Structure 1
Amino acid sequence: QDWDTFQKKHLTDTKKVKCDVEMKKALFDCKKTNTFIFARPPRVQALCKNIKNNTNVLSRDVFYLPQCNRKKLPCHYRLDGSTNTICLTCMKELPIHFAGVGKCP
């Protein structure tokens, strides 16, 4: 919804995210899946430069994507990872939504 919320739930400083610990936070509320992006805010923010408001952008470069997928109720997860391009929704040249992986919707 905003740059601040986007960072909190989609950017990570480590490849080994503690899913069971993170996902229980109110931001995630034990949702089925959440994909993290291993990168600093600057690199991610730059993807939205010169992008029309409320439109998506597909990155040219790849990122490692730590992903938490729920395996057992109510909040138990398995950590999965892969590498791929990311689709972000921009607003005022700032990412506010994680739109897709590999391509845009």
Structure 2
Amino acid sequence: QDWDTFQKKHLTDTKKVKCDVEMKKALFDCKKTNTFIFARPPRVQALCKNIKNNTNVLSRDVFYLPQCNRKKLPCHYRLDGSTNTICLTCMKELPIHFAGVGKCP
């Protein structure tokens, strides 16, 4: 929605995310899936430099993407992972949505 929420929902400083601890947060509310990006804010923010507002951009570089996937109700997950390019939605040169991976929508 916004840059602050994007960082909380999609950035991680660790590869081993504690899915069951984080996903129960109102931020995630035990949703089906959430993908994190292993990167510091500055590197991710740079991807939106020069990008038109409310449009998507695909990174040239790859990132490691820890992913929490709901396995058992109501809030139990399995940690998965993959590496790929990321597609972000930009607004005022700041990421506001994690649009897709490997390619933009």
Q: Secondary structure at the match of 1:104?
A: coil
Q: Secondary structure at the match of 1:7?
A: helix
Counterpart Cα distance in 1 of 2:96 and 2:32:
20
Q: Which runs of 5+ in 2 are unaligned?
A: none
Aligned to 1:28: 28
In the superposition, the TM-score normalised over structure 2's length comes to 1.00
Counterpart Cα distance in 1 of 2:68 and 2:102:
17
Q: Secondary structure at the match of 2:7?
A: helix
In the TM superposition, what is the alpha-carbon distance from 1:47 to its structure 2 partner? Answer: 0.1
Moved over 2 A (4+): none
Aligned to 2:87: 87
Counterpart Cα distance in 1 of 2:4 and 2:42:
13
In the TM superposition, what is the alpha-carbon distance from 1:55 to its structure 2 partner? Answer: 0.1
In the TM superposition, what is the alpha-carbon distance from 1:3 to its structure 2 partner? Answer: 0.5
Note if 1:96 corresponds to 2:96.
yes
Counterpart Cα distance in 2 of 1:65 and 1:19:
13
Counterpart Cα distance in 2 of 1:101 and 1:16:
20
In the superposition, the TM-score normalised over structure 1's length comes to 1.00
Counterpart Cα distance in 1 of 2:85 and 2:69:
19
- Percent identical among aligned pairs is 100
Counterpart Cα distance in 2 of 1:55 and 1:70:
29
In the TM superposition, what is the alpha-carbon distance from 1:78 to its structure 2 partner? Answer: 0.1
In the TM superposition, what is the alpha-carbon distance from 1:9 to its structure 2 partner? Answer: 0.5
In the TM superposition, what is the alpha-carbon distance from 1:14 to its structure 2 partner? Answer: 0.2
Encode CA deviations 1:60-81: one digit per residue, 9 max, x unaligned: 0000000000000000000000
In the TM superposition, what is the alpha-carbon distance from 1:102 to its structure 2 partner? Answer: 0.4
Counterpart Cα distance in 1 of 2:30 and 2:44:
25
Counterpart Cα distance in 1 of 2:7 and 2:17:
14
CA RMSD of aligned residues (A): 0.2
Encode CA deviations 1:38-74: one digit per residue, 9 max, x unaligned: 0000000000000000000000000000000000000
